[PDB]
Design a binder for these strands. Structure first.
Ligand SMILES: [Mg+2]
Ligand SMILES: [Mg+2]
Ligand SMILES: [Mg+2]
Length: 92
RNA sequence: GGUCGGGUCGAGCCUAGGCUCCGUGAGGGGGGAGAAGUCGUAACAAGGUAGCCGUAGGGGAACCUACGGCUCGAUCACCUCCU
C-alpha cells in the first residue's frame, strides 16, 4: 500500500551478507549494500528475493542505502494488478 | 677623514658528503569491535583418540603425527609404601 517517495525506489534482495547487511538490486541498475534499521529488524523476517523499499543515504547515494518497507505476496499481486511492478523486475 | 699594502678575527652565502624530522603515497600485513554470509566441531564429562609444555614436519580452518617431560587425568584388577 505504501509507495516510494523522493529518492525511494523499488529493489530486489540479491544476497545476505550477515551482520544485518543485505545486497539489493535497484530498478535503475545499481547494486547497493543496504543496512537493516533496528526498528523493523526485530519484527519482520526477510529472505533472499523479496521486494523492498530502498532509501539511499544522504551521503554517497550510489552504493549505500537502507530498507524501509517490505511487501507481502498479496501486496505483490495487488501491485502487479495495478501495473507498478513487472515480471522482468521480479526476475531481474 | 680618503686611497694602497700587510697581518688577524669574523656573521652571512655557495658546492659536495653524511645523519635526522615533517607531508603525501601504489602495494603488502596482522590487531580490535560489530553481527551472522559460510565450512567444520578443537576444548570443558573418560568431551567420546586424556589434556598440556619444548622441538620438528604436514594440513581448507580449528588441528594431526614423532621423541623427551608434567598431573593442572576418569574407571576396573593386581601390587607396593604408610597412618
Ligand atoms: Mg571433540
Ligand atoms: Mg579429545
Ligand atoms: Mg601426518
Amino acid at each position: 500500500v505504501p509507495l516510494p517517495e523522493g529518492n525511494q525506489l523499488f529493489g530486489v534482495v540479491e544476497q545476505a551478507l550477515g551482520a544485518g547487511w543485505m545486497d539489493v538490486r535497484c530498478e535503475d541498475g545499481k547494486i547497493r549494500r543496504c543496512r537493516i534499521p533496528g526498528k523493523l529488524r526485530r519484527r519482520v523476517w526477510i529472505r533472499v528475493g523479496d521486494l523492498v523499499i530502498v532509501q539511499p543515504w544522504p551521503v554517497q547515494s550510489d552504493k549505500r542505502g537502507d530498507i524501509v518497507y517490505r511487501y507481502t505476496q498479496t501486496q505483490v499481486d495487488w501491485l502487479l494488478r495495478k501495473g507498478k511492478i513487472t515480471q522482468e523486475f521480479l526476475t531481474g
